[PDB]
């Protein structure tokens, strides 16, 4: 359910001027229609995230509990600490070759094609293949794995009651499949360990505590939910920017060391996740606004990422920033566990693309935004190499 200031399709595809205006009028505002507080300014987004005691990640138990994302300390702290070791930049760095092999593979499958969808053909599959490798999905089981991960976040045929129904069947059908499949794999690895993440998670120990199989199960479902579409949107949003501003593409193709800046600046400018939800746990005054216990507090990273108070040239895509303290991965204790992996898949994806040569956006597409108003990315983006 989107905010009323976002009217057309073209605004969903570039709402940043809208959010910027809103940030100037009211850094905090209550939207009666959506029954929530929106926060647009960086300093107050940072503060919300940095104070889990005031602003909670907990959710109504009717909605699913996506593992650590929807926990508060002290529980969140214990579980994160058990899954942490596997996601640091050093821990995953060794995957660079495999991720390179995959991106090479995916681009080789579209060589004689004169145009292709970066989503379906490249950016969508890369995270699925990688997290499959990482988790320990055998290669021979990827097809169904990919299929229901795809199904997990599928769009709709229309925004009706009929197609929203159909989609939610499909999504939920995938969560069920994936819960069954992992439950099967967790169990497999529970009694015979393999050289993979699921096994590594089962063996973790901190203060004598282990994760339960159900915690590993839920964490594995989270990695797909949290890790696939967002990374896919990173690669696609980046390819989108690099075809909207070709000089940026060509600058980075010539100084390939700029790709890490390209990735952070894509995250800042075209953030795959544009908003973070919290439920207020106490009454708290933000500026002059009186936020009450129980109220929903949406912090907009896409607005925050462009705050004149924190970022120079906030509406200009710059690959030479000295710091890029966006909140596209959040901030604080819930800071994306997958940022090193997303940053590496992002880096490799952009590199292989640039090394293949110039590429351009294909003429006369109807760019279709992702349905959620918390997500920023497109369902399809056709490009062509020259
Ligand atoms: C560009 C890609 C990604 C973006 C933009 C992104 C964004 C985020 C954000 C904003 C949060 C914090 C949400 C909150 O504070 O409530 C988060 C959390 C998380 N992300 Fe991502 N994510 C990305 C990729 C990934 C990947 C690839 C993985 C793993 C494969 C991953 C795993 C997680 C997990 C497990 C959490 C929960 C951490 C916690 O709650 O303590 N993310 N992500």
- The DSSP output letter for 209 is B
Q: Are 268 and 380 in contact (CB under 8 A)?
A: no
Q: Which helix (H) or strand (E) holds 297?
A: strand 297-300
Kindly state the tokens that stand for 35: 């029954």
Q: Which two tokens stand for residue 64?
A: 């699913």
State phi, psi for 289 to the nearest 5 degrees: -90, 140
* Cα 259 from chain centre: 19
Ligand 1 centre and the CA of 241: distance in Å?
22
Which tokens is 386 given? 């020259």
Helix (H, G, I), strand (E, B) or coil at 273: strand
End-to-end CA distance of the chain: 40
Strand partners, 276: 299
Identify which of 40, 38, 45, 41 has the alpha carbon closest to the alpha carbon of residue 3. Answer: 38
Give which of 322, 302, 308 is closest to 14, Cα–Cα. Answer: 302
Domains and CATH numbers, the chain: 1-386 (1.10.630.10)
| CA–centroid distance, residue 360 to ligand 1 (Å) | 30
Cβ-contact 173, 196 below 8 angstroms = no
Ligand 1 centroid vs 248 CA: distance in angstroms?
Answer: 26
Strand pairing class (28-31; 116-117)? unpaired
φ, ψ for residue 256 (rounded to 5)?
Answer: -65, -15
Question: Ligand 1 within 6 A of 352 CB?
Answer: no
| Cα–Cα separations (whole angstroms), residue 37 to 146, 179, 297, 330 | 36, 34, 5, 18
**Closest atom of ligand 1 relative to the 127 alpha carbon:** 27
Pocket of ligand 1 contains residue 136 by CB under 6 Å: no
Q: Which residues pair with 300 in a beta bridge?
A: 275
Spatial contact of 75 and 83, defined as CB atoms under 8 Å apart = no
Binding-site positions for heme b read 76, 80, 278, 334, 336
- In the chain, how many H helices and how many E strands? 16, 11
Distance (angstroms) between ligand 1 centre and the Cα of 71 equals 14
Contact status, residue 65 vs residue 76, Cβ threshold 8 Å: no
| Cβ–Cβ < 8 Å for 376, 271 | yes
How far is residue 89's CA from residue 98's CA, in Å, rounded to a whole number? 15
Cβ–Cβ < 8 Å for 261, 324: yes
Nearest to 230 by CA among 183, 266, 264, 272: 272
φ, ψ for residue 268, nearest 5 deg = -65, -50
DSSP annotation of 362: P
Experimental method: X-ray
Minimum CA distance residue for ligand 1 atom 39: 334
CA Rg, the chain, in Å?
Answer: 21
The alpha carbon dihedral of 126, 132, 133, 139 has a sign of: negative
Q: Is the distance from the beta carbon of residue 237 to the nearest atom of ligand 1 less than 6 Å?
A: no
Q: How far apart are CA 328 and CA 369, in angstroms?
A: 18
């Amino acid at each position: 359910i989107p905010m009323q200031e976002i009217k057309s399709v073209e605004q969903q595809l570039y709402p940043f001027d809208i959010y910027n205006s809103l940030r100037q009028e009211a850094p905090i505002r209550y939207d009666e229609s959506r029954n929530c507080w929106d926060v647009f300014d960086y300093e107050t987004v940072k503060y919300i995230l940095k104070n889990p005691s005031l602003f909670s990640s907990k959710r109504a138990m009717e909605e699913r509990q996506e593992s650590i994302l929807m926990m508060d300390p002290p529980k969140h702290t214990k579980l994160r600490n058990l899954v942490n070791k596997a996601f640091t930049p050093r821990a995953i760095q060794h995957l660079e070759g495999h991720i390179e092999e995959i991106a090479d593979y995916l681009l080789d499958e579209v060589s004689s094609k004169e145009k292709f969808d970066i989503v379906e053909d490249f950016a969508g599959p890369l995270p699925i293949i990688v997290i499959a490798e990482l988790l320990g999905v055998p290669i021979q089981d990827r097809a169904l794995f990919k299929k229901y991960s795809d199904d997990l976040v599928s769009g709709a045929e229309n925004n009706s009651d009929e197609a929203f129904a159909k989609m939610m069947q499909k999504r939920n059908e995938g969560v069920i499949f994936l819960q069954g499949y992992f439950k099967e794999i967790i169990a497999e690895r529970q009694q015979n360990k393999q050289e993979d993440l699921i096994s590594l998670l089962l063996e973790a120990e901190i203060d004598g505590e282990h994760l339960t199989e159900e915690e590993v199960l839920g964490f594995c479902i989270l990695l797909l939910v949290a890790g696939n579409e967002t990374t896919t949107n990173l690669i696609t949003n980046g390819v989108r920017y690099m075809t909207e501003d070709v000089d940026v593409q060509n600058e980075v193709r010539r100084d390939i060391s700029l790709v890490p800046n390209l990735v952070e600046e894509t995250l800042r400018y075209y953030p795959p996740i544009q908003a973070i939800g919290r439920i207020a746990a106490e009454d708290v005054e933000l500026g002059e606004c009186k936020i009450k216990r129980g109220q929903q507090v949406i912090s907009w990273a896409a607005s925050a990422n462009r705050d004149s108070a924190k970022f120079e040239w906030p509406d200009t895509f710059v690959v030479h920033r000295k710091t890029n303290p966006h909140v596209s991965f959040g901030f604080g204790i819930h800071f994306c566990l997958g940022a090193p992996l997303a940053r590496m898949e992002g880096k490799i994806a952009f590199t292989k693309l640039l090394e293949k040569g110039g590429f351009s956006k294909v003429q006369n597409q109807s760019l279709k935004p992702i349905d959620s108003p918390f997500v920023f990315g497109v369902k399809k983006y056709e490009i062509a190499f020259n």
